[PDB]
Design a protein around this ligand. Structure first.
Ligand SMILES: [Zn+2]
Ligand SMILES: [Zn+2]
Ligand SMILES: [Zn+2]
Lengths: 69, 69, 69, 69, 69
């Protein structure tokens, strides 16, 4: 799966459908993996850099693969 | 769904019906989404700023959408 | 529901019947709400002040409502 | 149940039989309560002191009761 | 179980099959124990040294035993 975007988490969002949105770089992407919610919030609080991998590399795209750096 | 209130989590409360209350700004609001319990506590402990989105923007109003900043 | 006790969590205990006990102030109280187990352990680890609300305000009393501050 | 050992959680281990072993002090003990796993992992990562209670207070003995301090 | 690698967590990756990969030393290893995900992320964040134990000590090997030092 290609790199989609790399950077700090600017904000995260819990959505009404119970998915979890992240804003990294210039993209808003969401995931439906419940386990990623607390990992992504920790990344955000402590200021880690993340790399989101997905074929759906556009606003409102979904992802399931993340690299924390 | 529109912004209701933005600020630090002043306290949280586990309720008898297994919902979870947060006080943000001058409002107490609650959510029935289990996943938000641990995120909201972490946001409180680490002192994040949250934005709660809901139309029920009054004491005792419910929400399911939150932005963590 | 009236306040019973406010303070830091001195210790917590996992019991054989899969309930969870906390000692706050001079009271040991228990909850059978699984959701509170991880929330109370976090409050203990991070040094939060908790207020336990219950009508059974005596040693060995049960509760299901907590305020985290 | 009597106190068996008090100390920090030195390490943890998922066994083939779906039980969970911890080493506290000079003892490896195991539990089959799933709920206790995540509490013990949290105790382990944050360096809490635990007291394990069991009357099979020897290597390979089981427990279902824990005090977290 | 024999030691495989000891070192700092260089990065972690959440995978599409919901497993979690860590890079320690010169090895990428993964675990299917979801409870270990937040512990491994914390290790990465705080810069702890971990020892991973497995008898599959190759890139792409699986592990379930970790020691946090
Ligand atoms: Zn791929
Ligand atoms: Zn009440
Ligand atoms: Zn007993």
């Amino acid at each position: 799966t290609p790199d989609c975007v790399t950077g700090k988490v600017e904000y995260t969002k819990y959505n009404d459908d119970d998915t979890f949105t992240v804003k990294v770089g210039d993209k808003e992407l969401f995931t439906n993996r419940w386990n990623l919610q607390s990992l992504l919030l920790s990344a955000q609080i402590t200021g880690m850099t993340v790399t989101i991998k997905t074929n759906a590399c556009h606003n409102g795209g979904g992802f399931s693969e993340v690299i924390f750096r």
